[PDB]
Amino acid sequence: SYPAIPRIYAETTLNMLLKRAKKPRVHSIDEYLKDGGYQALEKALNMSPEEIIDWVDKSTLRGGGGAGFPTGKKWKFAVQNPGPRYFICNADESEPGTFKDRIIIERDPHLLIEGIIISSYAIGANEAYIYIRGEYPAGYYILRDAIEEAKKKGFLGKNILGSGFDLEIYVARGAGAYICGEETALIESLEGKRGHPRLKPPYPVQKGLWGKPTVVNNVETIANVPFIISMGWEEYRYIGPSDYAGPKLFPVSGKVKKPGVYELPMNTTLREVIFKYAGGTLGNKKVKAVFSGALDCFSSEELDIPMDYSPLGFGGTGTVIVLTEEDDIVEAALKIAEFYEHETCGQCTPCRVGCYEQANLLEKIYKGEATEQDWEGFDFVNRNIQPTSICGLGAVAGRLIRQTLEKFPEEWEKYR
Amino acid sequence: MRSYPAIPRIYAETTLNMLLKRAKKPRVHSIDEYLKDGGYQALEKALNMSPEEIIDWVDKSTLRGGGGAGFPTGKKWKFAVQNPGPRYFICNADESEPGTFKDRIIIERDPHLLIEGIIISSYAIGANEAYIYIRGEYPAGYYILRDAIEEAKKKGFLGKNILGSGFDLEIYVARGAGAYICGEETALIESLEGKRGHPRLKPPYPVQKGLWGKPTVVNNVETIANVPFIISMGWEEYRYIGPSDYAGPKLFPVSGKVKKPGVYELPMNTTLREVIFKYAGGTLGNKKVKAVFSGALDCFSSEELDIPMDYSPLGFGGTGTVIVLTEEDDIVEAALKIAEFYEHETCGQCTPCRVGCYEQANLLEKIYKGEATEQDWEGFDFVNRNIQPTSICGLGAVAGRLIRQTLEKFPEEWEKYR
Amino acid sequence: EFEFPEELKTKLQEHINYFPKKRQAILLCLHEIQNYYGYIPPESLKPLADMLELPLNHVEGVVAFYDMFDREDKAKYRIRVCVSIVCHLMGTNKLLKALENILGIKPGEVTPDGKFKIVPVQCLGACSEAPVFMVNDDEYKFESEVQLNEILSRYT
Amino acid sequence: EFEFPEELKTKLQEHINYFPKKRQAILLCLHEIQNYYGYIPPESLKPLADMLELPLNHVEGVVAFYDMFDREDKAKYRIRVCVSIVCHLMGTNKLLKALENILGIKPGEVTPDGKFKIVPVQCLGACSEAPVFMVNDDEYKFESEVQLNEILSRYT
């Protein structure tokens, strides 16, 4: 018995990450085993850690937590440093629009657990963590129970399946801070402190949890690992375009007919995501903008881009929030400003004051209460959140809003 | 199927705002609209109750079957569950009796009401497999239902472990292919098994031995559509609707010579007179009512309009199907149409039914066309009285009934033909 | 020697996989065949029976039993006309006359081009909208000849 | 001074023993305390700090930092309403209006009986189901006032 979850729609053309998670219920270990689950683990334990890293490298797998960093490369960096090492699954998923990771957690937890075990083996970590946001209580209980299931079947503990490899997975919960998805703040939180990002470099792979080499990977990234071992890197790389191969998850929301999570190859276009897969727009109204979570704003002239990590690609977490022709861009920008105001950790002065002022002033603009000085101030602050920032939040808190100012000047001009 | 086949926009009107709350508007109501009205909350409440409790509630509600026989629904379920599983649940959407078009408007306009009722009912009797058997001539309803089931699946109301309850259900949609007899519950089962629609000797009843010989509940569309209301309101509040011995909503498909033909949701204390004159707007041209045909089952004269639309001995009963004939309508011509129906629908297993349904129509046609001998007249009388013997289903039992009533109630018109 | 086109075969296989037991799909399969060919070709029953793992005898009996299926006449559009009590009372005969005027055929007949067949049927469960007809899956109230002519113009 | 009831102290001890180091259990402990009391009692932090082997100052700062924790208002049921972009677009305001109609309170307020508190929150990660709300750990899409009323009726 778990807390009530809304039944998010999920659809796949690849039948990999969403093979089970396309059905909105918990798939327990017996059902996972019937589908051939945990045989990739068994295969992996018969391979060298080095060989696993090599396959993951050659698969072209990239991080699903927003930056698209090559996973194998990350793991290679970690294992160049003396142990012990730690493995962390980032399940903080708190960016607006983004709900892809929870459906793996809540519906196919063993896919994630199997990937964690393989990944931990690959990097020589005997202690792994899942850090799940506090607002995912059902996912937390589901994972705790699935870990117990895995222990009882001998996939966790000491000397897993006679391999001599030991692993414990600990589940930690967040408590309301978006910034705890930033990998160094996550580590700080795991250490029992406030979620304050650390200056990088050093990257976690050099100095992470308790100062030791630590790999942080996103839920989606890790859920790919069992497929790479199962299929081999060649067949994996045959999925989608050769340079951005493999499945990707796309959480689509807002003004579409079929909001939900889509498992698609990365040669799919943004237009296809919206019209081919997500059923087109509510009321068949014209697309005005797509917000890539709280990161970017694409206009209706930019729909033909691929959902890959190329320079002209959509990139990120594949988060697609659709606004149509009647949606007020300034109102929407205010919501993005409010998010950053609520999430800056306050360590860096331009971020602390900038995220606050951006929202404060934009609220005045929206309500028709802004002076000429408020307008000029808003413009200045928007451009000056990033200086001295030590993490990506300060670097991007003004980015989406600036794009709206450039791409929808007429609507902003009306707020005069 | 974003686009469905064309359907006539049957008029629908309700004084109770239950079964026709959405189906009074002639269009498909999809799951979002259904959820906005509180849909599927009854399912949620049901899954927190024991199956035993749901049966008890449906029993105490006084709900009766809307497929013609008015059998107490909760009692039917109790009979099924006293037999070992697995059990099956079947929604009868064969609706093919002349005059009868009540079930289709629920299917085509408010499919989730039916689906929700199927899920609750299936849970109540412990069935993990349910069927809807829809007549072949309702293609729109079929596509609408297939699509609505997928919607329900997407929202987690169907499949395994529905809403964490541990209850599994799949609903399969089967199509008929032109036989009225496949509405008879045992022929329906034969058809579901891939055979001809031949009724089985009863007993055993389906609740004992049905689909693949296992306990099976067959219930009519209308019956099932009541179930969410019983759970939502509770049996006591439901029983407060209409007369306490025949409580809750009933659907009345009214057709023929009325100004407002269509489906009426009304309480069962409504009289036949009220159905025609208060609700269906009176008669075309304000002509006098001559007769009402209760589908192809009964003929009521103009002296019988003050009866209640309930399942009492002096009530209208049946499926509440009201076909109005007025003063200029030839009763013999009408009787012939009824004979032709039974001629076309006997399955032929039973000899008096097979030959009697055929001869009744053959001879009545001769009578109507003025080509009947004295022997044909006497033969027609005899055959009409002798369709029932040895019959194993209701069709043979009733194929002569309406016509006999017209012979008794309208002798002067028949005499004109003789 | 008779074989189902791949696209039909695929649809048949889908129906056969839909129910728990293959034989339950027999009516859905026959509907699909009639949809594809405009009738049930006699030669189709043998391979269908094989797919359902049923004797041919069984399949032939089912086809014969169910009135919607037609083994005799190919037609692109079946105009199903209700000839039961309510439609008769409210104007089946006017509909049949309008059809004869427009198409030149009577119940049971097919136009010379194979396009339309008039099929007299029992009550279609739309009696309030009498007199009722279908054109394949589409169903309509008959109002008048001009109205019917417009409706039929949509089927080409 | 304050001391935890034994059954709570047991649960806190389980969390503290779960991770390799005691201090890692701080957030699990605070969730447990908030679950137990309907808020974080100021007086609970000193004994918690002792069990975690942490300075009180450290614990106070953590409570202040993490937005899920509430030291001010006791409530049996927290109604967390998403006020972020997608829910706003798709009808946060309708949900809030429905909540005010049913409960008589606005965001930040507690009902007089201490039963419900409306807590505005950032994106709950269920944006396809906008507008989203939670009632304690349970999460729902808001469809309508009638639908919401029935959901809330489940919490006594």
Ligand SMILES: Cc1cc2nc3c(=O)[nH]c(=O)nc-3n(C[C@H](O)[C@H](O)[C@H](O)COP(=O)(O)O)c2cc1C
């Ligand atoms: C403000 C901020 C929030 C982030 N939130 C998340 C998050 O919720 N989940 C996640 O996996 N990565 C998040 N990241 C990115 C992580 O720091 C990190 O790059 C990622 O977890 C690495 O795993 P990957 O390579 O598999 O993507 C966030 C980064 C920043 C700057």
Ligand SMILES: Cc1cc2nc3c(=O)[nH]c(=O)nc-3n(C[C@H](O)[C@H](O)[C@H](O)COP(=O)(O)O)c2cc1C
């Ligand atoms: C010839 C014949 C045809 C029938 N047609 C139907 C029909 O189309 N729909 C229906 O639900 N019941 C029909 N019935 C009644 C069913 O056998 C059965 O009583 C009913 O489906 C049980 O459900 P209920 O108790 O909800 O009415 C028919 C019965 C006979 C004898």
Ligand code: SF4
């Ligand atoms: S950039 Fe902003 S969120 Fe990141 S460490 Fe600095 S103040 Fe905190």
Ligand code: SF4
């Ligand atoms: S009574 Fe008539 S319809 Fe019923 S089984 Fe016998 S022949 Fe068939």
Ligand code: FES
């Ligand atoms: S009598 Fe023709 S549709 Fe019913």
Ligand code: FES
């Ligand atoms: S914006 Fe409300 S759940 Fe994401």
Ligand SMILES: [Cl-]
């Ligand atoms: Cl191996």
Ligand SMILES: [Cl-]
């Ligand atoms: Cl005539």
Ligand SMILES: [Cl-]
């Ligand atoms: Cl054979």
Ligand SMILES: [Cl-]
């Ligand atoms: Cl101290």
Ligand code: NA
């Ligand atoms: Na989920």
Ligand code: NA
């Ligand atoms: Na968090």
Ligand code: NA
């Ligand atoms: Na913060």
Ligand code: NA
């Ligand atoms: Na019927």
Ligand code: NA
């Ligand atoms: Na309808």
Ligand code: NA
């Ligand atoms: Na089954």
